[PDB]
Amino acid sequence: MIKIIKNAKVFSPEYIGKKDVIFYHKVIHVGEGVNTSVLPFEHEIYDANGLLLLPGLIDPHVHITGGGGEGGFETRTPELKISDCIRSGVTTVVGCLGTDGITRSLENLYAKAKSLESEGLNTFIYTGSYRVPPVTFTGSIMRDIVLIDKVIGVGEIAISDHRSSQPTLEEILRIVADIRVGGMISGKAGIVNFHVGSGKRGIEYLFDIIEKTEIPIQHLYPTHMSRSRKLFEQGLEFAKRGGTIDLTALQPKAEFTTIDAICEAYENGLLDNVTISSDGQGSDVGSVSAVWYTIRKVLEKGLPLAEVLKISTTNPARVFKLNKGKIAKGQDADFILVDEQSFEIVSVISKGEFLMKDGVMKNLNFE
Amino acid sequence: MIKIIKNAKVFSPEYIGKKDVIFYHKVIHVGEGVNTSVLPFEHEIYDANGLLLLPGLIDPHVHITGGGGEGGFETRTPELKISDCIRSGVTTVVGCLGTDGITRSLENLYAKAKSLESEGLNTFIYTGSYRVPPVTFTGSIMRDIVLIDKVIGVGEIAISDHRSSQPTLEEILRIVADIRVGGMISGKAGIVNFHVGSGKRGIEYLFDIIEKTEIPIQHLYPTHMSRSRKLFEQGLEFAKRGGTIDLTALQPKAEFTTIDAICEAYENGLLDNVTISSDGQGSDVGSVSAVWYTIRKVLEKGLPLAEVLKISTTNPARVFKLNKGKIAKGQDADFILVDEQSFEIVSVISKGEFLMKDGVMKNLNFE
Amino acid sequence: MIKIIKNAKVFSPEYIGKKDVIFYHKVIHVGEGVNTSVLPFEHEIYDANGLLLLPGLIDPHVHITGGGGEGGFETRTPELKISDCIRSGVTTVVGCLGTDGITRSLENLYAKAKSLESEGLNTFIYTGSYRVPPVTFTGSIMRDIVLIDKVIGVGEIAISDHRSSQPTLEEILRIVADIRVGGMISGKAGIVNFHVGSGKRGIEYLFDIIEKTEIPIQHLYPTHMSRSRKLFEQGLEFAKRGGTIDLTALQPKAEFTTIDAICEAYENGLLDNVTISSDGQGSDVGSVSAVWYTIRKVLEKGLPLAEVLKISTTNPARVFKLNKGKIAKGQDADFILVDEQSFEIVSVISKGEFLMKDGVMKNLNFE
Amino acid sequence: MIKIIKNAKVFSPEYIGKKDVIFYHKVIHVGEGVNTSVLPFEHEIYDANGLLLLPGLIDPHVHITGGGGEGGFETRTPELKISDCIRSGVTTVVGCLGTDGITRSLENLYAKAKSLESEGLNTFIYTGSYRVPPVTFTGSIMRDIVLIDKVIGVGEIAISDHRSSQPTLEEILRIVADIRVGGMISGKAGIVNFHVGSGKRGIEYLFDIIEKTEIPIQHLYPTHMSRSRKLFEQGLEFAKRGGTIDLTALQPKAEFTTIDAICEAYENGLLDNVTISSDGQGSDVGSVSAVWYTIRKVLEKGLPLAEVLKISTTNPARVFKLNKGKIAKGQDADFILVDEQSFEIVSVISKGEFLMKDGVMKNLNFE
Ligand SMILES: [Zn+2]
Ligand SMILES: [Zn+2]
Ligand SMILES: [Zn+2]
Ligand SMILES: [Zn+2]
Ligand SMILES: [Zn+2]
Ligand SMILES: [Zn+2]
Ligand SMILES: [Zn+2]
Ligand SMILES: [Zn+2]
């Protein structure tokens, strides 16, 4: 069914004011309200007066199958619920494994990514986990990314962390070169996602790769880059050379935060190089609710919405080479509708289907 | 802490009337109320007047990690919640895999069994899954049962079913001989659990094993044996030769049922050879609530409670060689307290800890 | 871009006469010509007056990477050209390997299927090849169909043929059970495609599977079933029990033919159980042109077009569980436009893109 | 059966003087003698007047399956007898392999650990042996510690020794990181036990791990650290940074000894960082009798018993995260009874069972 959203202020994410959006699975037309609209086929209309229309948020780091286990088997966290995603405005998720690559399987990660997609979400996964050498579906990360549609990279590889497998630079280079080449063969981005711990070495290895080899900076995507001011300023040096860094969203649950980090990146013209992620179901427990929460905390510091949205729409889309994050002709019909007063998510659209309409969740399988 | 339950009618499961139970992790003493009780150490007392004290129920067939997936990735079911167990009177669970041995891992089954145990449940697992040759932790089912404490058998191996891997008698015999010998080395029972489908061959192979080889009938534990009157009467022939059969509990959610099956087994003196199981989280969805529900439906047909309890206490304990299912000195302190009028579970004790006291659930990690 | 085809007689494949079709990637609306059509967005119109609009043809058996090699390395055939497909009306192809599973790789089959899809074709592949035990991407055919989107089955497994690996019934049953279960987990059909040679045993094993096991007849898809009258009459017995059989299309390049076979199946009410395939690039050389050629030869025997089209639209779609073969709302916009006089293919549409418009091929990469 | 020890002076190991101990498998109550004791259940009383009650000794390094073989097949030593343990006051043993990882199997180490436990001992094992890369049950040390209850670490890895496999720092770091992460997932300590030879490098690598990585010092447990004054003073530098070191007990069978080592550690406030071990059945032959012998030699130098006991109770318990080494409520009922005059072991209790009562050994299987 073709649908039309009328009377919303649209952030594309660039503010283009009051515009009407016609979509199937892809956006057909953005423009001024028709006012004849005599249409020769069945079609749905949604009155979004009072609402902002945004691109659906992209969370590029979620433990969709559950994580935890750093404190024993009793610290394993539950799997992601799609209902959590819908009421937090997240329409696209990138799932990985974490510390535990033994009791959490890649095949379960894939299966979970496929069931989230069935219920109307958009999903991609990494192969590997914290440990080097990385777990694989097929015996090599290069075969994983060539043969399995949803695999977009390897991650999250731990460096400068007490849970790392203490990988060498040589081991890292082989993994980065394999996912880069596998990316080229398969027409995918080929991302290495680095879990960066609090170790003094920080992102040394990332600088070593770009200085000592021909490997472009765009495959290297460190996260937890707001863990400390010192790490975040190593991050801005990495951005200045063309890199993108990921900051762990503020959880709804205190000196230097992701909020400070985002404000510094803006003042220095590097907000194009910054993503945020929930680390949802991570070790208590990441919520995907952290993404819209974190955007709302940055707005309250005076930053314009067209600019803040980059961290959860334009920037993750560029990193993963997705046709998402943009309301525009031929882009995929993934949108959230926010109340212009309260800024509460009231409607959520993915592939042009309402997952949520005016606070009313669609029908789900175990909810 | 040493505890005492006073003023309950005790089913051990044999009815021994009004008796007092003193326990730590194991039962210290069953007998008449002290009426001096001047005890030289800290100690808890529970007034169970109005309540029946039962042995904790043993569900020998639960998909603790989730199952389903027969209808695509959207039909994968969620993992078991310990809270479901507690309020359904199940203190012991035996976890297996089902149709899906690809996206459901053995290591996850183990990890889940370990976290249920941390929260106060008693857990055992099978190695393998539906498919022959069976998935293993270590490359052989015999090494699995010798090296991994919780592995008590292989299961559930599908026979006479459209989801089976069409196993031969020779393949079955090798698997049964391996789990029997692995059982002997490890001092465990060595159970083969057969998923029996609706195929015309039924439990042919089980009769073939005992008639044509030296393999004792006690390792062979078919389930879904109330699927049809014809299969259940093959089951009673199997019981008459010394076998135990498992019947899928009636789900709280219509000619020949598990209720009819249990009543026939009683009238023919074969209730000692019968277990029930929820198939909890199985493909809608098995609930562990099915076990106490099914016991309550048999009571309403006039069968005595001391006799019905055998299917969820004495019989599963004998099959798996567990020190459970009996309220008696040196047995493990696993009990339920039922209201003598309503027959509602009001308290649940495992290893002598209250998981539930007077409808009040203990503190759990993601609940 | 939204497009509309005006003034064609539409075969859906049921004849619904002069109707107008509005589509993006999926069909939006079939119905009577608008005659106001004032549409508030960019949109393309195609005047198909003089043309029949058909569903795009589905060829379920093509050696897309090349085949041959039965007569030495000089008998290897070239890979499929997408241009061959377009000018033969084939919009969907199912690619497999044949006799040679050594020098022809599965990963090449996948890569070729992906490049045909990029140029605008719709592609699926089998895992395996002629030989039992079958070649795999990941070490098991069950993992292949669960993990790799395009894998829809195993094939083509040779039986009753001098190039077979002389597989046993037990080996066949394990392979059929694995692809059936892998199908259920992955939400795909799980087809076993049998290459049937001229050996006296014919499709004995197929009857053995359905008579002796619980395995439904719909997974079993023999081809070359018009090789002889005797084999084809074994085929009609298989159809009468619910099976679908595949007949090798007549090549444009003499007693009992595929034409006779199709006419017999119609007179006996079994045309619903019949597909044809080119065996394109097969050992001279199969052409995908055989499909439309074979449909044209059946029309010249007086059979109605709505009925003949079933063999290349409805029937392959049902076998592979595809949303193809039907012009109807929500179905994928794959169509051919035929001249009503000459019956020459003049336009070809896949995912709503013109691969060919009025004899003019789109822009291709090495053509 | 509940039991009570009356009239002993209790070292917990802190001296708490004349106290009474009530226990099942765990200690129920420590306190002043009841003097009413009218107890409503069967119960055993032991008159320990004239005896000191100590926590059962923990020997964290025993070749329970036999060792030796450095001088050819004729130098293989016999397996440990449980009777040796009982009459030497050792109630807990940690078993490993040594030089020979070829003819001594891990599965035998496990089996031996299980049979010692059956006869009433408490047992844990390491995976691996001297050689890097280390032998495993399952193909990785991380899977070994997650899947096998008794595996508490990897050991004993040889460094600075002529029998080492000359491991690199990188190989060591991977092994330490794997056992640390496997420890976290499994809720176990994750110990690397280093056999330190007489090579000039000593424990260089241990300092390299803590200085150059985020890996905490508590996983690193070198032994033979009294082999020389020079090595022992490297050991005290390691203790000063938070490490625990192991000293080979003096064998009952001459400048710088374990006695000197323990006295130096006390004078410098580092006795909390010191364990001793028999190296029992090691290459003549370690005896587990060395542990109580070595404690008796330190007492004869004037050190107080509450302090000396730390090396065989509190310190090994902290290293391995065991609920042992403490006489206290909820701790496991493992105790020795010593004659206050002669200091001879006269009774030994494990899990609250008498292995030895007044010089009378319990009934054993091949003794
Ligand atoms: Zn992380
Ligand atoms: Zn993470
Ligand atoms: Zn079943
Ligand atoms: Zn089941
Ligand atoms: Zn063929
Ligand atoms: Zn072929
Ligand atoms: Zn040593
Ligand atoms: Zn040693």
Author numbering:
A (entry chain X), B (entry chain X), C (entry chain X), D (entry chain X): 1 to 253, 260 to 289, 303 to 386
Please share text taken word for word from the publication where this structure appeared.
Crystal structures of the ligand-free form of FiBAP and the ligand-bound form bound with N-carbobenzoxy-β-Asp-Leu (Cbz-β-DL) as a substrate analog were determined at resolutions of 2.6 and 2.7 Å, respectively. Cbz-β-DL-free and -bound structures belonged to I422 and P2212 space groups, with one and four subunits in the asymmetric unit, respectively. The ligand-free model included most amino acids except for residues D254–R259 and P290–L302, corresponding to the flexible loops in the molecule. Zn1 is coordinated by E156, H195, and H224 residues, while Zn2 is bound by H61, H63, E156, and D285. In the metal coordination network, Zn1 interacts with Zn2 via E156. In addition, E156 in FiBAP forms a cis-peptide bond with G155 in the loop between α4 and β10, which is conserved in the corresponding loop of CpIadA between G165 and E166. The cis-peptide bond favors loop bending in FiBAP, which positions E156 toward the metal, as opposed to the carbamylated lysine (KCX162) in EcIadA, suggesting that FiBAP belongs to the Type-I IadAs. Similar to EcIadA and CpIadA, size-exclusion chromatography indicated that FiBAP is an octamer in solution, usually referred to as a “tetramer of dimers”, as supported by symmetry-related molecule analysis. The initial dimer is formed when the β-sandwich domain of each monomer interacts with an adjacent monomer, mainly through hydrophobic interactions involving several residues (I2, I4, V34, V35, V38, L39, F41, and I46) in the loop between β4 and β5. Additionally, the substrate-binding cavity of the catalytic domain participates in dimerization by providing the second point of contact between adjacent partners through salt bridges. These four salt bridges are formed by E107 (α2), K114 (α2), R143 (α3), and D149 (α3) of each monomer of the dimer.
